[PDB]
């Protein structure tokens, strides 16, 4: 074990690569599993294809000396970044470890995220971010705010260029929540995840309103009240199935075509290629001018079956979402007569 | 520019919304999609056209009207003035008035008015002061305020500095202590985008303690709507100058023309308080354990939590931590502000900024 | 002069501002004068047009804590950056102070230079660099190396765009 020989050095590296798997001891990983939740990395391993993850800055450590912070310096800083592939397509991803400083962002922690953001924009690949953690790390100072800006800045720079998906499986309080809003799609876990600027405590001691974290910013309130959540996953795994499904419709970037499936080669005319499912639409509209009907009946009959609805629990008077018509991905936008007669409203 | 000078109903109201500025005349001008009649014979609600969509409401409630004129003449005056700050199109630079040629340095061209800013900030850390006192003294006199009767916790408008047109975006300590909220955010976001569209430099007067707490802010989508101000600024490519006169905490600091947010020149007054959060709730986290032994062992908290709150305040809550990091280009006297913005505008005159190639972004709506 | 009053905070600024002119005591300044040389700052004033210089990151200080380096944290970190004019035209400039750590490049010192470069490129104006100092600060470690590279890169990006 001579730390001076090449062999000793390689051995030293494997020790750190090892500790990084549990930066704050294995006992911490136990509590996480004891709550049915997954680890920051286990989530990446779950979402990305098997054995496709390539971690970056896995051994980085914070460099602060304020308020006895130089006492505890975990590997990773409390964040797991890197890249892999979701269904064969390269993607850049990062997951926050709430067990490490409550998932609060520090300088190195920020640098690690900024690195992934620049990688995704540079390679023109999607950027997936799993959020879970308290506000900025106060001990480090304003450096955290500075890095925050750096992160937001890249989000608005990548907006509409690179698909950006945000997965909320934790709490996530503070300016931390502004990053997800800037992205394209925000996926939440109904219950196991919240989102809010100010915590119930402060809200309590400033307004008097007494509310719980769930009430204040759970998946259901951001899905039917704020209109910020695009999907409320029933469980962590479901949250992932949604994210892969979403990416299946989108291209790697704005300069690329949305992926298409094999398109059938019919013979026409349409009047001879009409199927039973098609004809069912000739009698779907009620003989009465006001009698409502589920617009989903029309949607499901038009495309190859299997509609990925967006914000299904928000403004149900309008239905939007992804699907495929003849192997071609299309965006559906329909009014739902079964709600407000299909009228349009602010939401 | 959209002038509403009568009752505008139906599709007659979408065109205005799509334009950049909406000027209405208070009393003689309305604006609504559905009329009171239909509303009543449907919801049962009883309202007049004036309450439904008059200038009073579209200015203070919906945040749609950028100006509520008293008379039609007033409306014209506003539009005539408004156009004097904007160029004919986004391909041309904003018109400039005869710029003044000083002698320099700044420390020698300080008017008695400039000096008034050196003592404007109260000695009491939380005592309010109207930010208008700072705007009036900075620009060449004459402020064309936008949405003045909406989200008063934030002030936006056009004015001139050294003859150069600028878009002013400042917080208002006399309303919510300067805090940011849904409405204020949206009010600024759109304004910022507008300035950028027509090459108008964005000057920001910072002084926000944070975001206004409240369940409603959340439920109504503060996170989503708040982002707009972030998006707008981060997107802008026009010269950006930010001056922190006092408070700047947490995320608010960021969304307020922060250095790392793309701001070109960041200035700060000696009274600036840039930090993650107020020293008040800071001690609770920082000196966590030390306060834990204030309930068990040596116990006196509340006389300890006030000593620590003062030590942290007197050592971290200031403009030098940020200045040392570079997030602030320089910490200067309030009086020096006006002259500093002048040279800055000149330096950034022909600034070069290229936004990523894309049909368009995807700002939250 | 109460640190808790606006007037005191204002006076505090003018106190550091004054110190930034001699980050290492007056004697050091008299030492370079006795050698028949100008100060890093005086050089900037000489070149640029009278009363035109606008200093950047004047009160900056290094954030290192290696090898008792935390004892000496001079203002400006050994380099004077900012802009001004030369014959009426705008220019960007930085001068290195050899009396501060030997003119050695540190993290902050580097950041200040990087900032000027990015300004020169952004504004599209000439970048004047007055060099005078040793290599990198061995005490700060590879950090200085990263910044050196950062400086070099910005140099080639500006090459042919901005007179340097």
Curated annotation (Swiss-Prot), chain A:
Biological or metabolic pathway of the protein: Lipid metabolism; mycolic acid biosynthesis
Gene giving rise to this polypeptide: accD5
Gene induction: Expressed at higher levels during the exponential growth phase.
CoA carboxyltransferase N-terminal domain segment(s): 6-262
EC number: 2.1.3.15, 2.1.3.-
Function description: Component of a biotin-dependent acyl-CoA carboxylase complex. This subunit transfers the CO2 from carboxybiotin to the CoA ester substrate. When associated with the alpha3 subunit AccA3, is involved in the carboxylation of acetyl-CoA and propionyl-CoA, with a preference for propionyl-CoA. Is also required for the activity of the long-chain acyl-CoA carboxylase (LCC) complex.
Gene Ontology molecular-function annotations: acetyl-CoA carboxylase activity; identical protein binding; propionyl-CoA carboxylase activity; transferase activity
Catalytic activity: N(6)-carboxybiotinyl-L-lysyl-[protein] + acetyl-CoA = N(6)-biotinyl-L-lysyl-[protein] + malonyl-CoA; N(6)-carboxybiotinyl-L-lysyl-[protein] + propanoyl-CoA = methylmalonyl-CoA + N(6)-biotinyl-L-lysyl-[protein]
Activity regulation description: Carboxylase activity of the AccA3/AccD5 complex is stimulated by interaction with AccE5.
Nucleotide-binding in keyword set: no
GO CC terms in record: acetyl-CoA carboxylase complex; peptidoglycan-based cell wall; plasma membrane; protein-containing complex
A Gene Ontology biological process term: carbon fixation
Signal peptide: none
Protein name: Biotin-dependent acetyl-/propionyl-coenzyme A carboxylase beta5 subunit
Source organism of the structure: Mycobacterium tuberculosis (strain ATCC 25618 / H37Rv)
Keyword S-adenosyl-L-methionine included in the entry's annotation: no
Top-level lineage group: Bacteria
UniProt keywords, alphabetically: Lipid metabolism, Transferase
Quaternary structure (record): Forms homohexamers. The biotin-dependent acyl-CoA carboxylase complex is composed of AccA3, which contains the biotin carboxylase (BC) and biotin carboxyl carrier protein (BCCP) domains, and AccD5, which contains the carboxyl transferase (CT) domain. The AccA3/AccD5 complex forms a dodecamer, and can associate with the epsilon subunit AccE5 (Rv3280), which stimulates carboxylation by the complex. Is also part of the long-chain acyl-CoA carboxylase (LCC) complex, which is composed of AccA3, AccD4, AccD5 and AccE5.
Family listed: Belongs to the AccD/PCCB family.
